[PDB]
Symmetry: C3
Subunit: 159 residues, 3 copies
Amino acid sequence: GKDSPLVNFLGDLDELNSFIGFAISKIPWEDMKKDLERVQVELFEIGEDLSTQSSKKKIDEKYVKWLEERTVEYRKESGPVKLFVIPGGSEEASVLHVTRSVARRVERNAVKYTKELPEINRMIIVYLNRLSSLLFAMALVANKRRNVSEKIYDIGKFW
Amino acid sequence: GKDSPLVNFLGDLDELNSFIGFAISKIPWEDMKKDLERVQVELFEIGEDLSTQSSKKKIDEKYVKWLEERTVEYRKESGPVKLFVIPGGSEEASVLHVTRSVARRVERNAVKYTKELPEINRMIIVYLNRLSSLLFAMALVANKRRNVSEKIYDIGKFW
Amino acid sequence: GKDSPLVNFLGDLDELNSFIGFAISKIPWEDMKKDLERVQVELFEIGEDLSTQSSKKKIDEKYVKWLEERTVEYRKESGPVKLFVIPGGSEEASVLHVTRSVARRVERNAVKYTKELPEINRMIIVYLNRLSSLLFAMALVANKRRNVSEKIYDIGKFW
């Protein structure tokens, strides 16, 4: 039976994974390609965690850790940015922002699916949350590397 | 708490805003880039309207007006087109059509969110409706500027 | 009245149709462009089937047949591939995978819409299911034609 919470969650993961594959094909920098390729493998691990109630794979803090550390490294390169950043700029940053918004849609759906499947590993939602911040940091670096300035809808805070 | 109607509406606005950022990065014409960049700022204003029950920003008829006037200008350039237009053609028109279909998805979701949040400013749904027609008109002009003919699934009407 | 199951189904078909239009604009091979252009026309026929309770157009086995036969031809060219394929590679295969994941989202939604509209022609869901496999086969051929190797998250089976 389809349309189930599990099938839909796996479907959302695949959609996100496919946009990531598209971002990788449009980004020329090896550091970002390497990081994103690791995320794709881990999205498959997340799917196996979900599909086997954490029996075959179990997402834990180390997965989340790596996302946070890479996020810190990209931000070190881009430097501080005013919030909010209007998504866009270089085609590389633009595709990363699209991918980021899809990751956020999967994150919201995951919270909803957890209501129907309380057994879902909570670390999965944390991973998804950290992933969107990593994608955001990568988009900032993409524009910097492309000599493109960030467009801001200024709310008075910076990151 | 996430998964709420407000958080989901804001998430949909961000996804649309990100596709618009992607369309801008793929379009070489300054008139379209200028118009789309204004829409991105206004999507942030729409988000603030929603988030503050129209206290900090309030979408009104003038926002919608500008969308309609620009729509008329693009259509003046493309001339009449038979309906239905099969989405595609130049990469520029194709990305505009994708963006248009996402705007329509946000518009439908907005109608659904209004059921859970009757306080939402109705002008927001009107803005979203006009935006998809503007994106459609821009896609027609994009193909014309690219010497690409529109593909038609003819229903006997023209616009 | 919007937000209805019919309006949402038609909206999902349009979103899928628009991504297909985008994939066509990014693919240089005439065989794939021809096949995808036929799918776009048929998505409009599916919309008319839905909108007229199969009165004006009626999706039947021959539609599905053509999808399966073309799928077999692309697979003959790509040869066998290990599963699971991590979506991505060439920009052509990447956009095809994104389109494939959207087709799968429309397929899942269709199952849900059928619950609210039991009159929907069941062959429509079958068509959507076959379409995602065709898109998958095309993505394999796209990478082969681009000298790009498939990335695999190996589950021990091949197709």
